[PDB]
Amino acid sequence: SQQVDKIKASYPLFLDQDYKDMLAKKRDGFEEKYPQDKIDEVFQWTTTKEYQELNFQREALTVNPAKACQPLGAVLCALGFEKTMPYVHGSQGCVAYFRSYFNRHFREPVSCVSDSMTEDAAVFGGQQNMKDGLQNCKATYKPDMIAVSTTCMAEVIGDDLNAFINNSKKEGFIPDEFPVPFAHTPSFVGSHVTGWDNMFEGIARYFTLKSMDDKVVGSNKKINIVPGFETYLGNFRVIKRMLSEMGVGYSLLSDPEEVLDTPADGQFRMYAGGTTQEEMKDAPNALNTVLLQPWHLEKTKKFVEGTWKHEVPKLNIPMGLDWTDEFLMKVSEISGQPIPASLTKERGRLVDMMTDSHTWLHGKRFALWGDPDFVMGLVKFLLELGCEPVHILCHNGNKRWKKAVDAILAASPYGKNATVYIGKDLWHLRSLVFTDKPDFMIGNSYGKFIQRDTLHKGKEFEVPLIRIGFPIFDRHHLHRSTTLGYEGAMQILTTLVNSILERLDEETRGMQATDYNHDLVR
Amino acid sequence: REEVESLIQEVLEVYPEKARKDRNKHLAVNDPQSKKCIISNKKSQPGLMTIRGCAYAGSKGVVWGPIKDMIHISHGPVGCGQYSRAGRRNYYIGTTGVNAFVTMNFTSDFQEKDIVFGGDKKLAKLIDEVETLFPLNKGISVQSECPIGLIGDDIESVSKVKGAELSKTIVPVRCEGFRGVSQSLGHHIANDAVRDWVLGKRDEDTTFASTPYDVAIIGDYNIGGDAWSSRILLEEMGLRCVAQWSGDGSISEIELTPKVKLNLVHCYRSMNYISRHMEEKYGIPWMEYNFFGPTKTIESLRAIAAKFDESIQKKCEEVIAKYKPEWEAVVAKYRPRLEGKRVMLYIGGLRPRHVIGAYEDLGMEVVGTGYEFAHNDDYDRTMKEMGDSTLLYDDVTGYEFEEFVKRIKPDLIGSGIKEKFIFQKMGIPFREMHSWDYSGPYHGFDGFAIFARDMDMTLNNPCWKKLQAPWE
Amino acid sequence: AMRQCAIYGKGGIGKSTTTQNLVAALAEMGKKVMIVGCDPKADSTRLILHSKAQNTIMEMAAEAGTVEDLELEDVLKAGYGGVKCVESGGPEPGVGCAGRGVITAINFLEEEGAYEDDLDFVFYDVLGDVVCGGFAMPIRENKAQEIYIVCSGEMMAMYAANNISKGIVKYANSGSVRLGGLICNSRNTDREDELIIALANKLGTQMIHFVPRDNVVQRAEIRRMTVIEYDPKAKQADEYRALARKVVDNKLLVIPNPITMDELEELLMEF
Amino acid sequence: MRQCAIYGKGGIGKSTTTQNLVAALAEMGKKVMIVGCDPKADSTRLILHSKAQNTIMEMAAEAGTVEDLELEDVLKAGYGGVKCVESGGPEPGVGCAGRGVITAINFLEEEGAYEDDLDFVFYDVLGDVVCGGFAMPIRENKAQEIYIVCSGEMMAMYAANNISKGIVKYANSGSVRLGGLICNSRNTDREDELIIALANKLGTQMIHFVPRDNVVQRAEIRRMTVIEYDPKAKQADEYRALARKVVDNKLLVIPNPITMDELEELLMEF
Numbered sequence A: 001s002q003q004v005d006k007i008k009a010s011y012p013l014f015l016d017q018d019y020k021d022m023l024a025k026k027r028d029g030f031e032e033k034y035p036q037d038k039i040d041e042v043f044q045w046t047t048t049k050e051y052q053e054l055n056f057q058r059e060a061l062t063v064n065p066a067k068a069c070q071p072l073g074a075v076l077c078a079l080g081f082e083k084t085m086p087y088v089h090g091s092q093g094c095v096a097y098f099r100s101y102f103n104r105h106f107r108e109p110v111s112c113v114s115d116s117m118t119e120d121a122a123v124f125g126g127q128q129n130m131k132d133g134l135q136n137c138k139a140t141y142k143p144d145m146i147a148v149s150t151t152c153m154a155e156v157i158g159d160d161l162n163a164f165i166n167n168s169k170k171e172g173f174i175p176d177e178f179p180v181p182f183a184h185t186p187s188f189v190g191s192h193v194t195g196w197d198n199m200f201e202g203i204a205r206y207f208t209l210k211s212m213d214d215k216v217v218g219s220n221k222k223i224n225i226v227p228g229f230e231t232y233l234g235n236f237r238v239i240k241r242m243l244s245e246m247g248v249g250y251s252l253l254s255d256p257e258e259v260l261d262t263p264a265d266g267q268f269r270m271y272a273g274g275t276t277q278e279e280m281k282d283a284p285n286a287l288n289t290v291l292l293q294p295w296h297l298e299k300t301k302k303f304v305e306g307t308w309k310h311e312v313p314k315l316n317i318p319m320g321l322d323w324t325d326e327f328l329m330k331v332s333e334i335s336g337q338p339i340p341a342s343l344t345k346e347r348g349r350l351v352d353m354m355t356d357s358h359t360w361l362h363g364k365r366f367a368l369w370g371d372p373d374f375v376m377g378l379v380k381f382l383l384e385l386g387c388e389p390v391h392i393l394c395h396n397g398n399k400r401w402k403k404a405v406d407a408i409l410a411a412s413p414y415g416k417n418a419t420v421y422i423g424k425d426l427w428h429l430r431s432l433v434f435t436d437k438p439d440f441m442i443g444n445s446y447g448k449f450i451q452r453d454t455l456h457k458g459k460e461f462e463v464p465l466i467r468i469g470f471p472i473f474d475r476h477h478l479h480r481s482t483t484l485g486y487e488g489a490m491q492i493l494t495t496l497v498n499s500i501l502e503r504l505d506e507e508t509r510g511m512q513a514t515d516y517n518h519d520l521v522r
Numbered sequence B: 001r002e003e004v005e006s007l008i009q010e011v012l013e014v015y016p017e018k019a020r021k022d023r024n025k026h027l028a029v030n031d032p033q034s035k036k037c038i039i040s041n042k043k044s045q046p047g048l049m050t051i052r053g054c055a056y057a058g059s060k061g062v063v064w065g066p067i068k069d070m071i072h073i074s075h076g077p078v079g080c081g082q083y084s085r086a087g088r089r090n091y092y093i094g095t096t097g098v099n100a101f102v103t104m105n106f107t108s109d110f111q112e113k114d115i116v117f118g119g120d121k122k123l124a125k126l127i128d129e130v131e132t133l134f135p136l137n138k139g140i141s142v143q144s145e146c147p148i149g150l151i152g153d154d155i156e157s158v159s160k161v162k163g164a165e166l167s168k169t170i171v172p173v174r175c176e177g178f179r180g181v182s183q184s185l186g187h188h189i190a191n192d193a194v195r196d197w198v199l200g201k202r203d204e205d206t207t208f209a210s211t212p213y214d215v216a217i218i219g220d221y222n223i224g225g226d227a228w229s230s231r232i233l234l235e236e237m238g239l240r241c242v243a244q245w246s247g248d249g250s251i252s253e254i255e256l257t258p259k260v261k262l263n264l265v266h267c268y269r270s271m272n273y274i275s276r277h278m279e280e281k282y283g284i285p286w287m288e289y290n291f292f293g294p295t296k297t298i299e300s301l302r303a304i305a306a307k308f309d310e311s312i313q314k315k316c317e318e319v320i321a322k323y324k325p326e327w328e329a330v331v332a333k334y335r336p337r338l339e340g341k342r343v344m345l346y347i348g349g350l351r352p353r354h355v356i357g358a359y360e361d362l363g364m365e366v367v368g369t370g371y372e373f374a375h376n377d378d379y380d381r382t383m384k385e386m387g388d389s390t391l392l393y394d395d396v397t398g399y400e401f402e403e404f405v406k407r408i409k410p411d412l413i414g415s416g417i418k419e420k421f422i423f424q425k426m427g428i429p430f431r432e433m434h435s436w437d438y439s440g441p442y443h444g445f446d447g448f449a450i451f452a453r454d455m456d457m458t459l460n461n462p463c464w465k466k467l468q469a470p471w472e
Numbered sequence C: 001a002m003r004q005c006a007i008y009g010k011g012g013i014g015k016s017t018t019t020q021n022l023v024a025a026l027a028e029m030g031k032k033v034m035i036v037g038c039d040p041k042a043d044s045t046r047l048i049l050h051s052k053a054q055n056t057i058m059e060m061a062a063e064a065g066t067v068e069d070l071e072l073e074d075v076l077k078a079g080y081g082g083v084k085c086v087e088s089g090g091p092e093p094g095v096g097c098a099g100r101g102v103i104t105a106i107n108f109l110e111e112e113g114a115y116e117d118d119l120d121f122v123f124y125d126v127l128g129d130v131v132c133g134g135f136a137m138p139i140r141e142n143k144a145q146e147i148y149i150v151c152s153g154e155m156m157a158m159y160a161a162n163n164i165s166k167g168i169v170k171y172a173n174s175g176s177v178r179l180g181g182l183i184c185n186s187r188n189t190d191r192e193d194e195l196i197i198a199l200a201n202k203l204g205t206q207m208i209h210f211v212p213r214d215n216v217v218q219r220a221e222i223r224r225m226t227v228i229e230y231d232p233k234a235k236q237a238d239e240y241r242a243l244a245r246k247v248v249d250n251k252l253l254v255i256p257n258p259i260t261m262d263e264l265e266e267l268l269m270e271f
Numbered sequence D: 001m002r003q004c005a006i007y008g009k010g011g012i013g014k015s016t017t018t019q020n021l022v023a024a025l026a027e028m029g030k031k032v033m034i035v036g037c038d039p040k041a042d043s044t045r046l047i048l049h050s051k052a053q054n055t056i057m058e059m060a061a062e063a064g065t066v067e068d069l070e071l072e073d074v075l076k077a078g079y080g081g082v083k084c085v086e087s088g089g090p091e092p093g094v095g096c097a098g099r100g101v102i103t104a105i106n107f108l109e110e111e112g113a114y115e116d117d118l119d120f121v122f123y124d125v126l127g128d129v130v131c132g133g134f135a136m137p138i139r140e141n142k143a144q145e146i147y148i149v150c151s152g153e154m155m156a157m158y159a160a161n162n163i164s165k166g167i168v169k170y171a172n173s174g175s176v177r178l179g180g181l182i183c184n185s186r187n188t189d190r191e192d193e194l195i196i197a198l199a200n201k202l203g204t205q206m207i208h209f210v211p212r213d214n215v216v217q218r219a220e221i222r223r224m225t226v227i228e229y230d231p232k233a234k235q236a237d238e239y240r241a242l243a244r245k246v247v248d249n250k251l252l253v254i255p256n257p258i259t260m261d262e263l264e265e266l267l268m269e270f
């Protein structure tokens, strides 16, 4: 039944007595459900350390991973160049999934095409698919560039992207001079960050490899910034703002901030901003190349050092206080420009907030997960705050990154109770947060299901989630936030302290039971 | 009519020659035999931003995923599962991680060595680990991805051996994405999977007590509780709903389905294969029903009752009388805010024609509709519903849909997520027709109120009047 | 009553030729013998269908759209002695994925019931290298029940036979497929008789027959015929019918025992 | 450096001809390295004097990835200092070997392998080029010289024509060319009847011919290369002759693939 005054959506409509009776009848009659007591015993068993030992011996099953496949990162990197069409040579269901993922995260239109290989294209190859797709895409959407990635089907059968593109150019399907960079992005190795790196290396190769005879280092007096896989627009904005306040000439390669943040003014802008082809062609002339996320920019670093002859600095991600200072100092050394008073003031403001909130922040226990550089930056910043990271999880991490994070933890007295896990998924993390309960988790939307499970064990066992990472689906406009630099540090600090205070207010809202600590001033 | 044809030609004048001829056959002006007007179920033209998915999306995400007590393994690389985890709002009741697994992502997480050396051994070990860690699961399905189909992994043998060894049903589904042209072949493959591995397990069992009022809801995936909002009506009419396919559905209900008296099929496109199979093998009659809006709901309820005795018809009349004032009040409240408005739709394979009656019940006209992966029978069905000199598009592209909307200028557009923000930035209200914009249910009398309220809050929201800066 | 057999071996050993010659001999004896070529080169049915084997499942699958649309009569062509022949086909070398083509063709044939007519024999002729699970599709469950490995002297032939037995073991355990024997396609070698006899006993199989190397085979292949159709009188046409009868009467079906090929290299030193 | 690719019919004697060829170029002054391209790795047995059992694919599986694969653990010396790297793959009927070829060639590109002082890198590919992966040796920056090894028998010539059809696309898209047709023997009536005819119809030449010398099989039994087993025999002299032709080969035209009707007529023509 529905009252026209107060219409109920699924919640709380399905809590009415008629719907409860319907569900009870269905369950009792035809579902053959286990007894409720059995379900309770099994759930209790899933929260025990014995179940954790069983869970951590997995060698073949993955449950609730924390990563995606390479072509997603390839598409994200392709979107950072001006009038550029991401073109995923392979099947369509993948581009459909990529677009769906990115629309849900950004609440933005995302442009990407596929050549839609069928079974016949798998058996016979995708050269004709390559030709027809390139021609159709250029005719229909009119890009200045088409950046080609691959789905796994294409990788397994060994489709030669270079040969297919050259044959397309030679047979007149697309102009010979039209830029079509490509990269092999096999989904069965690495993750989305690897796809981003491979796509960027492909684009840089296409625009720079054959024309290095006339390049000299430092002639354009700029610094190349490679952001890597970045889903916070405030990160691009803060990097650009900090460099501009510094007076440093810079070239942000693969900058998608404009295309992912277009205004709603009655027209649909498919392309906006992005790195220009002139900037890519002039990139070897820079003073140096700075990689913001060095732990998934390995192939790019190899190419830049080997070809462009740039002495890439060994810089951690500019997250937190110490690493932002090391980034600013390195940029000042490379460019010769001093750090302005505005940056010093904003650093001092961040330190002021740190000393203001240290009392509530100290000793808190966090689990966290995400991409390698993001995770290690979060770990460092938490260590600087007096907090205690406990469960550090990175599904797409490697042993060198794990050793680096272990070194970072061992340098601080707040890392003694911290264990770094690589190759483990969110089911492992569910076991971890059940067995060694932390105060909070920090991670993407997928952690919400962990929170639910903890709340099912009891209110006292619940671990609240703090949404910092990718993807964020159940909240709006969090992709506009910042994580890099002092600004991102203040945003993260505020989110952490206010999450702690909100939880404390929730636990002390009980009248005549816990309200004695329901303080007006915290 | 001539204006629509002129717009079709103008839009087509942008594609290359082969693309132009191919796209010419998938656009038509409705004239209330679709083969002579529009052709469907064909390969998409490369590099044009189609909206269609893959066979894996139509098998794992649509058919098998909503089955709650089963564990579904996305066999292959990690991407497919990750992108399809909890993306579809097929509601269910259960304890996730104990006895329900809809929102969970189980995968083999294929590496390079898996491709080079095969993944059957890893598949067997994964089945063993699943059985160890999730004991209350009532079955396993193995949904193949593209590399599995390419390298020829014998997942059927593994399924048979492990089902024998651990005494549980393991359904291997060969839904590799490159098969077919859309999700339709995924629906088909999933349906033969159910037929071959699940449907006939209780064929020799006579323990179930059957009543003459036994009906099975077929092809309702419980989006936002939609199936529930239908089931109650069917139960208020004296009918007993034995099974639901597959939203909030259990393997026991699917096994019990061959015992029903009548099969009420909601989604023809995805479940007609199993419906016809059951009619031919067990002799169960089946028929379509439509619960979108009050008029189609009343017509469907009367049609359902007409298949039974007089008591069912009397209870149907009582149900119609009971729910009459609610939908009359909803109409009297929300129609004046909606009369005369125009809607353009682009949904997958069933909804573009089912939701038309609910739109008409609010005084709203559909001027354009189309399908992602529907067949010719779907267009045959939708020709009668659509008005004269309207627009039909099959497997429309981004450019074509944008140009069609730019020239037609509808009041509302109902479609998927991949164009929601596209049409939002063009100043036209847009309403997700796949996830119900995270709202619903829309089925039944209870869902009609939510449908009307959502239509009003989106069409008449003031934000649409603020897209031009006062100084420009 | 339909016996399903699959012919494997080292590339260039004569699988296709020996297979067609037998199908001719079986047809002369009198039995309906389907040939299924699992080679993208579309070369397994040329001495029997004459011509060049023309139509393939994959090519009309591409022509008609998807594999579902195409009808069985299009690719199924009867030839000499009523020998119905079908070839999977595939891409030109260096592109595509032939294994998927073989998988699609085999599924096509089952769902259209090509085998499930009242036949007597089905002979799959598989490529020599077998680099993926698709080319092992003829030896899955409900597929070919007997396997014949064609080999010769030297070292590469027995090496490939041992490796193919290694690969066969998994499907033999997973199903009901068994190795029926070894066909020795003599090249010119010396002591190859003892070599192959010893190798078969080492693997637990038998030497079902020995085929001499004769140029009448080349002569008949140039004119697009088998030897049974070219000239029944000649020798080397006799021990095609001979091993045809031997295959008909064969009963030793075993699971192969692959040997750590240090043992095979020793065997080469001895024999 | 002359990166070359040995293609042709399966079982026609590629790794045999290739191994004695590189051994003849060895102890002639030059430095060579063999790279195989088929899972049943035995293309370096003669030079290595033993089957490898240490290929790129199994070691990558053991370590976990090719990123952990150090180069020195898969490259070995041999007769005349010939480097040999076997790359390997799955047992028959399982997995995907073409992806193994892709991964191993990419690994050899990444780890500095080709950038030594050697003269020829001889890739040696299986007869059944069933997917694009096995066509990796003829990609861009890869081998530039294809030597189709085929015999006078009809089926070998048909395989050579099919391979030419396959490599047309790579030749047009890149710079790899058909160096010449390598002729082995089956003691047929051809040996100029359909080998020079096919070569000129493919626009190419037959670069020397090696007949059915029985010595090669008994040298194969001995783990041996002919010049290493009988360094004063007729087969060994023929193999220096082949090495000499390989040294001074200049005809590098794009293959022109003749049609099936042309092959059928050519069979009766000779």
Ligand SMILES: Nc1ncnc2c1ncn2[C@@H]1O[C@H](COP(=O)(O)OP(=O)(O)O)[C@@H](O)[C@H]1O
Pocket (backbone or CB within 6 Å): C009, C010, C011, C012, C013, C014, C015, C016, C017, C018, C128, C185, C211, C212, C213, C214, C215, C217, C218, C221, D153, D154, D155, D156
């Ligand atoms: N017994 C034989 N005597 C002479 N030549 C033969 C004999 N068997 C096969 N051949 C020749 O060997 C060539 C290779 O045979 P083929 O059928 O291609 O084997 P596969 O299919 O295993 O490569 C054929 O062209 C054929 O003429």
Ligand SMILES: Nc1ncnc2c1ncn2[C@@H]1O[C@H](COP(=O)(O)OP(=O)(O)O)[C@@H](O)[C@H]1O
Pocket (backbone or CB within 6 Å): C154, C155, C156, C157, D009, D010, D011, D012, D013, D014, D015, D016, D017, D127, D184, D210, D211, D212, D213, D214, D215, D216, D217, D220
């Ligand atoms: N010139 C020759 N004289 C005698 N036997 C040869 C000659 N060339 C090759 N063979 C034999 O034929 C077999 C061919 O096998 P292999 O060299 O592996 O061919 P492929 O590499 O093309 O498969 C070898 O084992 C060898 O004994």
Ligand code: ICS
Pocket (backbone or CB within 6 Å): B058, B062, B088, B183, B221, B223, B267, B269, B270, B347, B348, B349, B350, B351, B352, B433, B434, B435
């Ligand atoms: S199954 Fe189909 S695309 Fe019939 S794949 Fe799709 S929950 Fe659509 S128009 Mo999402 S043929 Fe269902 C559908 Fe309709 S997922 Fe839902 S809304 S009625």
Ligand code: CLF
Pocket (backbone or CB within 6 Å): A069, A070, A071, A091, A092, A093, A094, A095, A097, A150, A151, A152, A153, A187, B054, B055, B056, B057, B077, B078, B079, B080, B081, B144, B145, B146, B175, B176, B177, B178
């Ligand atoms: S049609 Fe392979 S991991 Fe899955 S997203 Fe694709 S690159 Fe990445 Fe596409 S979704 Fe999958 S892969 Fe095919 S079955 Fe359909």
Ligand code: SF4
Pocket (backbone or CB within 6 Å): A156, A157, A158, B150, B151, B152, C096, C097, C098, C099, C100, C131, C132, C133, C134, D095, D096, D097, D098, D099, D130, D131, D132, D133
């Ligand atoms: S090895 Fe087999 S499965 Fe892999 S790409 Fe080649 S033909 Fe296809």
Ligand SMILES: [Be+2]
Pocket (backbone or CB within 6 Å): C011, C012, C015, C127, C128, D010
């Ligand atoms: Be062969």
Ligand SMILES: [Be+2]
Pocket (backbone or CB within 6 Å): C011, D009, D010, D011, D012, D014, D126, D127
């Ligand atoms: Be070979």
Ligand SMILES: [Fe+3]
Pocket (backbone or CB within 6 Å): A106, A107, A108, B421
């Ligand atoms: Fe937005």
Ligand SMILES: [Mg+2]
Pocket (backbone or CB within 6 Å): C015, C016, C017, C039, C043, C044, C125, C126, C127
């Ligand atoms: Mg053959």
Ligand SMILES: [Mg+2]
Pocket (backbone or CB within 6 Å): D014, D015, D042, D043, D126
């Ligand atoms: Mg070889």
